Design a protein around this ligand. Sequence first.
Ligand SMILES: *[C@@H]1O[C@H](CO)[C@@H](O[C@@H]2O[C@H](CO)[C@@H](O[C@@H]3O[C@H](CO[C@H]4O[C@H](CO[C@H]5O[C@H](CO)[C@@H](O)[C@H](O)[C@@H]5O)[C@@H](O)[C@H](O[C@H]5O[C@H](CO)[C@@H](O)[C@H](O)[C@@H]5O)[C@@H]4O)[C@@H](O)[C@H](O[C@H]4O[C@H](CO)[C@@H](O)[C@H](O)[C@@H]4O)[C@@H]3O)[C@H](O)[C@H]2NC(C)=O)[C@H](O)[C@H]1NC(C)=O
Ligand SMILES: *[C@@H]1O[C@H](CO)[C@@H](O[C@@H]2O[C@H](CO)[C@@H](O[C@@H]3O[C@H](CO[C@H]4O[C@H](CO[C@H]5O[C@H](CO)[C@@H](O)[C@H](O)[C@@H]5O)[C@@H](O)[C@H](O[C@H]5O[C@H](CO)[C@@H](O)[C@H](O)[C@@H]5O)[C@@H]4O)[C@@H](O)[C@H](O[C@H]4O[C@H](CO)[C@@H](O)[C@H](O)[C@@H]4O)[C@@H]3O)[C@H](O)[C@H]2NC(C)=O)[C@H](O)[C@H]1NC(C)=O
Ligand SMILES: *[C@@H]1O[C@H](CO)[C@@H](O[C@@H]2O[C@H](CO)[C@@H](O[C@@H]3O[C@H](CO[C@H]4O[C@H](CO[C@H]5O[C@H](CO)[C@@H](O)[C@H](O)[C@@H]5O)[C@@H](O)[C@H](O[C@H]5O[C@H](CO)[C@@H](O)[C@H](O)[C@@H]5O)[C@@H]4O)[C@@H](O)[C@H](O[C@H]4O[C@H](CO)[C@@H](O)[C@H](O)[C@@H]4O)[C@@H]3O)[C@H](O)[C@H]2NC(C)=O)[C@H](O)[C@H]1NC(C)=O
Ligand SMILES: *[C@@H]1O[C@H](CO)[C@@H](O[C@@H]2O[C@H](CO)[C@@H](O[C@@H]3O[C@H](CO)[C@@H](O)[C@H](O)[C@@H]3O)[C@H](O)[C@H]2NC(C)=O)[C@H](O)[C@H]1NC(C)=O
Ligand SMILES: *[C@@H]1O[C@H](CO)[C@@H](O[C@@H]2O[C@H](CO)[C@@H](O[C@@H]3O[C@H](CO)[C@@H](O)[C@H](O)[C@@H]3O)[C@H](O)[C@H]2NC(C)=O)[C@H](O)[C@H]1NC(C)=O
Ligand SMILES: *[C@@H]1O[C@H](CO)[C@@H](O[C@@H]2O[C@H](CO)[C@@H](O[C@@H]3O[C@H](CO)[C@@H](O)[C@H](O)[C@@H]3O)[C@H](O)[C@H]2NC(C)=O)[C@H](O)[C@H]1NC(C)=O
Ligand SMILES: *[C@@H]1O[C@H](CO)[C@@H](O[C@@H]2O[C@H](CO)[C@@H](O[C@@H]3O[C@H](CO)[C@@H](O)[C@H](O)[C@@H]3O)[C@H](O)[C@H]2NC(C)=O)[C@H](O)[C@H]1NC(C)=O
Ligand SMILES: *[C@@H]1O[C@H](CO)[C@@H](O[C@@H]2O[C@H](CO)[C@@H](O)[C@H](O)[C@H]2NC(C)=O)[C@H](O)[C@H]1NC(C)=O
Lengths: 397, 397, 397, 397
Amino acid sequence: ANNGLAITPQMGWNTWNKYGCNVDEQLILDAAKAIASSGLKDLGYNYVIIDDCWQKNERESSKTLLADPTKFPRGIKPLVDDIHNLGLKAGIYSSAGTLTCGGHIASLGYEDIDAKTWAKWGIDYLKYDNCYNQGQSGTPKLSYDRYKAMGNALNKTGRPMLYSLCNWGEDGPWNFASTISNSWRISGDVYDNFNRPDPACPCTTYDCVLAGFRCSVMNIINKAVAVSQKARSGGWNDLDMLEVGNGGMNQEEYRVHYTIWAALKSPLILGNDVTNITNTTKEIIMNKEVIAVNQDSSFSPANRIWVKGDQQLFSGNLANNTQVVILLNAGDSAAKMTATWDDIWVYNLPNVDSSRSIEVRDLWKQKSLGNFSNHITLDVPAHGVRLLKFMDSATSS
Amino acid sequence: ANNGLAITPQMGWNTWNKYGCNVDEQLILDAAKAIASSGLKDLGYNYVIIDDCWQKNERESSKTLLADPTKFPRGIKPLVDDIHNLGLKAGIYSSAGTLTCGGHIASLGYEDIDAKTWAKWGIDYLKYDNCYNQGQSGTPKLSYDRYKAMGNALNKTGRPMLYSLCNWGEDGPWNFASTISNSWRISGDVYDNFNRPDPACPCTTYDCVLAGFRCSVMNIINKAVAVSQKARSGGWNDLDMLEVGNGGMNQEEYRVHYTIWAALKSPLILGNDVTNITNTTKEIIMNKEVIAVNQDSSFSPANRIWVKGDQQLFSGNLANNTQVVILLNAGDSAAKMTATWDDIWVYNLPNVDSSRSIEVRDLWKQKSLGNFSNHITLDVPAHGVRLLKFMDSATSS
Amino acid sequence: ANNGLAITPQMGWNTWNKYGCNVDEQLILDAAKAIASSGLKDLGYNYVIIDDCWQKNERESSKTLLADPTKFPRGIKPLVDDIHNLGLKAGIYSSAGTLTCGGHIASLGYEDIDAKTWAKWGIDYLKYDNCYNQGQSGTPKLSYDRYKAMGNALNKTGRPMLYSLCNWGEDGPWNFASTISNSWRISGDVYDNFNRPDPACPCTTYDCVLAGFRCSVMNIINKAVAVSQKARSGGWNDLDMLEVGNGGMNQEEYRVHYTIWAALKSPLILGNDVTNITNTTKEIIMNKEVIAVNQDSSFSPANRIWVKGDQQLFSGNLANNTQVVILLNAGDSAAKMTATWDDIWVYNLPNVDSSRSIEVRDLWKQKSLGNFSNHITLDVPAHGVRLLKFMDSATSS
Amino acid sequence: ANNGLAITPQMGWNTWNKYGCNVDEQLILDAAKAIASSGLKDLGYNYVIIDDCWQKNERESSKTLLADPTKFPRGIKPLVDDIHNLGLKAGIYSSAGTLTCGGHIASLGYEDIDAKTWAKWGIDYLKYDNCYNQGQSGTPKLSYDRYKAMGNALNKTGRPMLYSLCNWGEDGPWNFASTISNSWRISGDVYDNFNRPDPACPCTTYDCVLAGFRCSVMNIINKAVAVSQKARSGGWNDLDMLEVGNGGMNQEEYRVHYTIWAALKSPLILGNDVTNITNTTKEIIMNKEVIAVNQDSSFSPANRIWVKGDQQLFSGNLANNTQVVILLNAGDSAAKMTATWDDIWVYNLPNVDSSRSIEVRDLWKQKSLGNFSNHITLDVPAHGVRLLKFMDSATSS
Ligand SMILES: *[C@@H]1O[C@H](CO)[C@@H](O[C@@H]2O[C@H](CO)[C@@H](O[C@@H]3O[C@H](CO[C@H]4O[C@H](CO[C@H]5O[C@H](CO)[C@@H](O)[C@H](O)[C@@H]5O)[C@@H](O)[C@H](O[C@H]5O[C@H](CO)[C@@H](O)[C@H](O)[C@@H]5O)[C@@H]4O)[C@@H](O)[C@H](O[C@H]4O[C@H](CO)[C@@H](O)[C@H](O)[C@@H]4O)[C@@H]3O)[C@H](O)[C@H]2NC(C)=O)[C@H](O)[C@H]1NC(C)=O
Ligand SMILES: *[C@@H]1O[C@H](CO)[C@@H](O[C@@H]2O[C@H](CO)[C@@H](O[C@@H]3O[C@H](CO[C@H]4O[C@H](CO[C@H]5O[C@H](CO)[C@@H](O)[C@H](O)[C@@H]5O)[C@@H](O)[C@H](O[C@H]5O[C@H](CO)[C@@H](O)[C@H](O)[C@@H]5O)[C@@H]4O)[C@@H](O)[C@H](O[C@H]4O[C@H](CO)[C@@H](O)[C@H](O)[C@@H]4O)[C@@H]3O)[C@H](O)[C@H]2NC(C)=O)[C@H](O)[C@H]1NC(C)=O
Ligand SMILES: *[C@@H]1O[C@H](CO)[C@@H](O[C@@H]2O[C@H](CO)[C@@H](O[C@@H]3O[C@H](CO[C@H]4O[C@H](CO[C@H]5O[C@H](CO)[C@@H](O)[C@H](O)[C@@H]5O)[C@@H](O)[C@H](O[C@H]5O[C@H](CO)[C@@H](O)[C@H](O)[C@@H]5O)[C@@H]4O)[C@@H](O)[C@H](O[C@H]4O[C@H](CO)[C@@H](O)[C@H](O)[C@@H]4O)[C@@H]3O)[C@H](O)[C@H]2NC(C)=O)[C@H](O)[C@H]1NC(C)=O
Ligand SMILES: *[C@@H]1O[C@H](CO)[C@@H](O[C@@H]2O[C@H](CO)[C@@H](O[C@@H]3O[C@H](CO)[C@@H](O)[C@H](O)[C@@H]3O)[C@H](O)[C@H]2NC(C)=O)[C@H](O)[C@H]1NC(C)=O
Ligand SMILES: *[C@@H]1O[C@H](CO)[C@@H](O[C@@H]2O[C@H](CO)[C@@H](O[C@@H]3O[C@H](CO)[C@@H](O)[C@H](O)[C@@H]3O)[C@H](O)[C@H]2NC(C)=O)[C@H](O)[C@H]1NC(C)=O
Ligand SMILES: *[C@@H]1O[C@H](CO)[C@@H](O[C@@H]2O[C@H](CO)[C@@H](O[C@@H]3O[C@H](CO)[C@@H](O)[C@H](O)[C@@H]3O)[C@H](O)[C@H]2NC(C)=O)[C@H](O)[C@H]1NC(C)=O
Ligand SMILES: *[C@@H]1O[C@H](CO)[C@@H](O[C@@H]2O[C@H](CO)[C@@H](O[C@@H]3O[C@H](CO)[C@@H](O)[C@H](O)[C@@H]3O)[C@H](O)[C@H]2NC(C)=O)[C@H](O)[C@H]1NC(C)=O
Ligand SMILES: *[C@@H]1O[C@H](CO)[C@@H](O[C@@H]2O[C@H](CO)[C@@H](O)[C@H](O)[C@H]2NC(C)=O)[C@H](O)[C@H]1NC(C)=O
């Protein structure tokens, strides 16, 4: 959407994974202070998003929906003021249905009223779910009209609010939602697992009528590669929250997860604990050079160039004629992987000079690997990535 | 739906399989008395559901549809009074179409009138079919509006009536029907057969435009595992009626059928003979410990954790930190099957203590198997199950 | 539909395959006289259906569409009178679109006017195509409304006209069309070929968005077996016209084609030459015992019981407790095939007596094969059938 | 559509591939002069189509959308006059959405106004894209209504304008668009590559909800063969622009690409450089005998008769009882391929004389191969074709 927001993908943190329905004012305020104090804020993670279970049990006579008075004894607005004081922005969650996924009151048919409430509170960001939608889906037009009702509602408040769709790829939001929202979930929810299939996440492709949840990292990657082509500044594919630090994956698996989310220009919303961040977690989420790929001014997702057995190659443009290249090894053992210049710049063929000498930097290690021509061969860990920046292009005029 | 009904899955018995179109007042009354006298009523099977072929050949001038005067010489109301006197509840069948599946007058366009008639009769339960729907399906919205017309009609009578959808999973009722009905058929009709495929049941997955009938037990299980995630108190996936005792399956096959229907929180509607219940049938349908799994206060279906060849593992939470675990052997020969603690509590990883010693009870045998740590290995019959309750959890804080 | 017509499947002959766009008054009249004189009329083939290319180039100022004055110099009505005089009924073709498949003026938006014209002419039968439908398809509701407009138009003339849908299975007419029409094409058009696949007939199952044409006999059979379950007196699945005698198949292939169309209760519309009928053709299309299966008073299609490699078994009820059984050998060489009593009456299990001695008749040979118990084993030609009638049932009370 | 245009498939050249967003008045005028001077105009390539990025940044107060004043300092009309003076016709691009694929102002909701502007400018041809369509797709009816709005808008100007749909096969334009437009894209965009699969072009068949781009030549061919059956004079399947000369394919690959596009009666729109045409390019795009196949008066696409491993046979009618035959070798090595008379005229079986002696001409070589009976065997290069004309038919009366 052309609303001045999400010019690059949004970055932030969300209450759900850590706090769930135990979310309250004090936990949110402590997390926001940890986000600021740890350095995450200055790295770019500036949205603090209050997920499901903030809601009071019933709407007011006035029809507005206030926050639970026990969890939020001052109401939401004074909490948002405290977040704003930290130099952070505040997000809120609802659903495009009668109820949220957690069974709380949601916004279908109350879009104007709820948007007005959030604007009054100082909310800067809405995550808008797809539970209990009363059969208002199944065609792009049905889903469009329902999400457009809230998009219009937000707009009319006059307050800029980042509009994050959460409809799990149903009816193709990469087609229908691109001018009316800032980002759209493309799949069922990720879980803290690298590649285990699950019956609650039956779909393996972008084309899905039951998005579900418990979708592995690899499941989501195979869906994302089809829809990257639709992503633009202000309008991103959302691969769901980052699981880094939660413990169900190893470090190389988290590195893969973070790398691909970053390079495909997903929003980078932390779905973890920010109050006790281990060195292992900091290594993955606080690398400025990797963040700079996600936040790159060319606004282009990396493309998947090939799949060879369990190996995958990604390649994308970055600013100033540079290139991001990712070797991904989905196999159970470490492997030597090779990227050729003709593959890295495949879409430019035949206008590629394979003999061109180019400096390659390893962005995780934050070191130059030196100059290479023709191809590069590197060790890639099991379930692992090597994330490379080419400091020039082999493309011929 | 939030109408105070089906807080746990409904249990009962239906006239179709035994009586079909020969259904009449006396057969229903004899079955209700057998349900009460055999102990089935006190076990929880309290709904007596009159299926298709009760209808008079034409509507009254008043537009109401009365019962066939030969089959029901006093009308339906006095029969419902007799059922109520036995401490039982009464159900009736119609279709969301111009005709029922049996070709009798049905309720499309007459929803208010028919609901009013049923309320006057004292009906407590509606099974609402999907035959002859005049093309009013193919999107979630089309099917939603048609089923919502009857949901609203029932509601406005002021009489609580359990609303059982019978649209065979068309357009995803687990999404559209969850706030407007109490349960929804997810597949084409079961038949008295464990695993034989049939051309009238072509679909093998939840995503289906021709649900059909003659779907085997195993066919239905493979569909159900995708949609369990949507089930909630008051709003259940319905795997169709129980075939136990009809004779086309052996005892271990019926045990599997009953176990999975119970653990996936399907309604448990007996589709059999209640006037002559063999010891073999009683063993399967009158086990209080198995019924207690279906009726568990946590209201959670068991999840399918893995498929390994013809073997399947299910695991789900029960009340007071206990767990239901099912080993299912779909192979033609008995096998030793193993469940590990890490698999049983997979969604909790890494917060699982595999060394935790826990008592395991066999619910069919109704005996403690003793304490186990790490894994359990058991003999499982061909087309068979072992149904286990873990008396504590291995989950770590 | 409940309009008194197609109580059994319709039988007849259609101008297209033989005459195409060269159709005219004299050719139709000569074919009708051949139908009467050859004995086809008295066998049951009583509809003479005028297919595409009868139309005048433009509608009248009055908006009616008359017949081409060169091809039909007296108009259609006097030709229909001549057909009626032969004891035959007359059919006409149009499309539910702006143009017919041949590019002539069709009936979308003119349904009342065109139905009125046909009734005035004495037409008894409409074949109603799906070409040029202006995007009015893609959901059951879209296709339903378009076909309902003509169904209503025909009805209001007061003249009984058999309503034959020709929408090639799009959006599932076996669901939507069953109360508003007498029969519905379920697939793209057959061609004179037993099993050759073709890119114009890409779909292999009932679920299809491009029905196309050049669908082989075997292609159509594999689609039909899914939808047989929906067929009822007055409302039939239509497997398209019979190719018998056209020359692109051998006699055993035509026997298979005719047998399956007959036993699945398809309309039997001859799509061949009736003015020169060879002995080989008469053997296939003039066998009263095979016609009696199609016209059986139980109105039930035979069901496909199994597929074993290239072999298929069909079994269905006939009147007076008899059974039709078909062994079908889709393989390139003759084979001995076996049907067991438990398979023939599979849906009745366990209530089947496999030792029951029953007389079996070969309907093509028109001879008793004697009595059998348990199973029957017979020689079946390449691409061939054996068509059997069991003179009693093995089903136990 | 019956608007007097595209009686044979349109031929021309499009600005996108060569000039992209650097398109301007002078480059267009130089290309039009090269088209005329090189002989391309007189061969039939007479449309000069201005693609995306011509647009001014905002609409006028009057609501019309003018051209970028820097790129087009005289406006579009005087440029169209210059094109007309060369004996050429002018085309323009927009999208059926709020924005074009390049992010410029597009025509949804402004169809009458924009059509009026183009008619005033003297535009003869519209390419009408499917980007940013606001969820107005997903059924044939949704897409139909959106494309019909522009079709009607063009018509009402009174100026004949060739209406080229560019919706990439979404919702089946071969069904819905055939009477309201002159041609319809059937797939995601071609790229300069013979057979490399790409994740942005996930679909391999005509049935697709994400058409994407980077579809190889072979990918598009496998889609086209399903829909050829729908093509008619004035209403063509569009296989996207010709890549010939761009360099990412070899000469035999381009020959295959051009041959199949020509024989399937695709529009032949050059998507290359016309200002420097190599001898290798001229050999492929300036062969009058191949163009004569595309422009043949029988207006019939060739049909794919078989696929045998990596080999394919195409056969179609041409004027005066002649036949086009194509042997296509998609394998990596040259092969001897055989076409039999029974396969070439398969749809005429059994009325084919395989012994019929017929002269066969090689259209690329422009030489007679002499007379053949029964079959022909020829060398076919890797990724290659042999394009044949049979000077008579083997079909028997
Ligand atoms: C409620 O909804 C409304 C409606 O959506 C929304 O209002 C929009 O708000 C956004 C954000 O503030 C506005 O977007 C900004 O628009 C600025 C002006 O854009 C126009 O002018 C540009 C400059 O023109 C100069 O140069 C051109 C050269 O071509 C020359 O002719 C001119 O004479 C002039 O000198 C021009 O570039 C721009 O063109 C773009 O769009 C056209 C049409 O699609 C396309 O052809 C071009 O290729 C180009 O993409 C346009 O015509 C703009 O400068 C500004 O852009 C800067 O910031 C954005 C991010 O905001 C960056 O992406 C970009 O790189 C720039 O640095 C920005 O896009 C928009 O105008 C409003 N729309 C309307 C209709 O009012 C509200 O915000 C919503 N409110 C709430 C509370 O939610
Ligand atoms: C025709 O249709 C109508 C419309 O659907 C239907 O009317 C409904 O009927 C049902 C059944 O009788 C009613 O449901 C009951 O509602 C009871 C009241 O619920 C509210 O209040 C609860 C208690 O509030 C206290 O505690 C809170 C703490 O949070 C505190 O703030 C308050 O001040 C107060 O002290 C509250 O818990 C409840 O909240 C639920 O819902 C909200 C919003 O979605 C969510 O945020 C919460 O998480 C929670 O889930 C709500 O606000 C309720 O007590 C009662 O629940 C008991 O029984 C049910 C089953 O019935 C059990 O599931 C449950 O465990 C409890 O033991 C029950 O749910 C409902 O209110 C009617 N709705 C309306 C609009 O009238 C008719 O019945 C239909 N008629 C016919 C004939 O068919
Ligand atoms: C324009 O459209 C209209 C609207 O569709 C159409 O009008 C219909 O035309 C058809 C054909 O003429 C009519 O159908 C006939 O109806 C006859 C009467 O049917 C009723 O009565 C039957 C007998 O009742 C007796 O027995 C019962 C025992 O149960 C007893 O109670 C009664 O007191 C009485 O003594 C009854 O059997 C029948 O019941 C059927 O339907 C109901 C409801 O769905 C169902 O519950 C039953 O199971 C049963 O199926 C009904 O109530 C009927 O006799 C006759 O049937 C004979 O012929 C048909 C074929 O026509 C055979 O299939 C059958 O075996 C019988 O031999 C037939 O069906 C219909 O009534 C019209 N409908 C209306 C609303 O007017 C026009 O024809 C159209 N016009 C044009 C020009 O196209
Ligand atoms: C190692 O790789 C780097 C690129 O990562 C090479 O640097 C590149 O060197 C080329 C040739 O010297 C530079 O191109 C030149 O640019 C100048 C203008 O600055 C122009 O006048 C020349 O015509 C030529 O095109 C290029 O700028 C430079 N790129 C970067 C990003 O620095 C380096 O040469 C490689 N080392 C070796 C030993 O080859
Ligand atoms: C056999 O398995 C059972 C569980 O099915 C084990 O019983 C469990 O024993 C543990 C440890 O003794 C109990 O946890 C403890 O709870 C008390 C409070 O009651 C707390 O103070 C301790 O810190 C500790 O957490 C647990 O309650 C109990 N669970 C149940 C359901 O009884 C039993 O120990 C096993 N036997 C052997 C030999 O290990
Ligand atoms: C050869 O097969 C035929 C059936 O196709 C056998 O004929 C059937 O014979 C049985 C037993 O004799 C008959 O059932 C009986 O019916 C009478 C009433 O008629 C009843 O009183 C008995 O209790 C018994 O159920 C049956 O009607 C008859 N079916 C037909 C269609 O004729 C025949 O017996 C077989 N031959 C041999 C040597 O087994
Ligand atoms: C080489 O192939 C060509 C066809 O490409 C053969 O030419 C064809 O020859 C036949 C028989 O001579 C011609 O048919 C005849 O037409 C006349 C009327 O012109 C008719 O009176 C006869 O009954 C017969 O049907 C046919 O016109 C002609 N076709 C063409 C396109 O020229 C030629 O015969 C072959 N050469 C050899 C040695 O077989
Ligand atoms: C932050 O997390 C770390 C690592 O998980 C915690 O360090 C552990 O402290 C506990 C309890 O005091 C000990 O059992 C372990 O020895 C420590 N584990 C490791 C890996 O070092 C730490 O407690 C947390 N920080 C705070 C202040 O709670």
